[PDB]
Every structure is written in structure tokens, then in C-alpha cells.
Amino acid sequence: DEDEIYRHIRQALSSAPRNQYTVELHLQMIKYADKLEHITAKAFCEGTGLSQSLGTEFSKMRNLTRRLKAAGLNTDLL
Amino acid sequence: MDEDEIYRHIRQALSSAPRNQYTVELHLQMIKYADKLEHITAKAFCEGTGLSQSLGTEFSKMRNLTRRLKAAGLNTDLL
């Protein structure tokens, strides 16, 4: 499961234009955070091809996602 | 809503949040009001909300997520 998720994230990021990359990165983190609750930020960056420096950003987005879902976000639609 | 009243809503939510929820609340408030603040710079956002200019980059990131988040069902009235 996690490896399929990482492939989907990589396909989305590799396809994003430069000026949409940061947005797409954050949206992919939010999209899958609820299926990756058990993973470390380090493992997330390794799986997706991201610099390990982005780990804190994943940790932030994973916390944010719980509150966005409570406000109606359906992460399947991202 | 005038921009300053939006800033006051953000300041009030930040003041009301527990310390251990501050950073999440800040990002949620940025998302909540980004689309009513489309005309402001991140510098003006930080000045209006009493935040360090170093947080401007956080507003720049969050404000550009709203279109896709709302299309996926996010109701900012619930934030």
C-alpha cells in the first residue's frame, strides 16, 4: 500500500510545472497523510524522492490534514 | 469584510489557541481567509496579524492551496 502511494506521489510531482511544484507537494502530502499516520517523516521523503529537508513540512501537513478533514475536506478528491 | 477585521479574526483565533495547537491553528487561519485576502502581500499579512515576516512564506504556501482544497470539499466556514 505505502509503496503504491509513493509511486502515485512521484507521478504527480514529476508531472508538475515548476511554478506549481510547491503547491502540488503540499497537496500530495495532505492527500495521503491519513493513510500514512504510522510512517516517519524520514520514511515519507525516502519513499517519494523528496529531500529529507522536507520532513518537517510533511509533519506539519499531516497535522493540518486532520483538521481540514473535520471541516469537510475529502482527501480522495485531491 | 475589511482586511483589518479579517486580521483581527486571525489574531483572535491565534490568541485563543493552546500553545500546542498554535502552529496548526496559524496554518488553518491562513487557509480560512486566504481567498478574502487575494490582494495582499505576505508582508502585509504578517504586519496585519502581528507575525514575524519569517511566517510570510507560510502564508504564501497556504494561500495557494485553497482552490484545490475547496474543490475537494473544504468548508472554510467550519474553520
Residue numbers in the entry:
A (entry chain B): 2 to 79
B (entry chain A): 1 to 79
Question: How did the manuscript describe this experimental structure?
Answer:
Consistent with analytical SEC, RptR formed a homodimer of two helical monomers each comprising four alpha helices (α1–α4). Each monomer presents an extended α4 helix splayed out from the dimerization interface at the C-terminus; the intervening surface consisting of the two α4 helices forms two basic (positive electrostatic) regions that likely present the DNA binding site of RptR. Although structural homology searches using Foldseek and DALI with the RptR structure did not identify any close structural homologues in the PDB, the arrangement of helices α2–α4 is reminiscent of the tri-helical motif of HTH transcriptional regulators that are also dimeric. In contrast to RptR, the dimerization interfaces of HTH regulators are typically distal to the DNA-binding domain. In RptR, dimerization is mediated through hydrophobic interactions between residues in helix α4 and the unstructured C-terminus of the protein (i.e. residues L74, L69, R68, E25, and L65). Leu74 of one RptR monomer interacts with Leu69 and Ala72 from the other monomer, and vice versa. Dimerization is also further stabilized by residue contacts that are more distal from the C-terminus including a key electrostatic interaction between Glu25 and Arg68 and a hydrophobic interaction between Val24 and Leu65. As the crystal structure of RptR bound to DNA could not be obtained and given the very high similarity between the crystal structure and the predicted model of RptR in its apo state (RMSD = 0.50 Å), we used AlphaFold 3 to model homodimeric RptR bound to the 9-bp DR sequence. In this model, the α4 helices in a RptR dimer, which form two basic clefts in the apo structure, form the main DNA-binding interface and insert into either end of a single major groove of DNA.
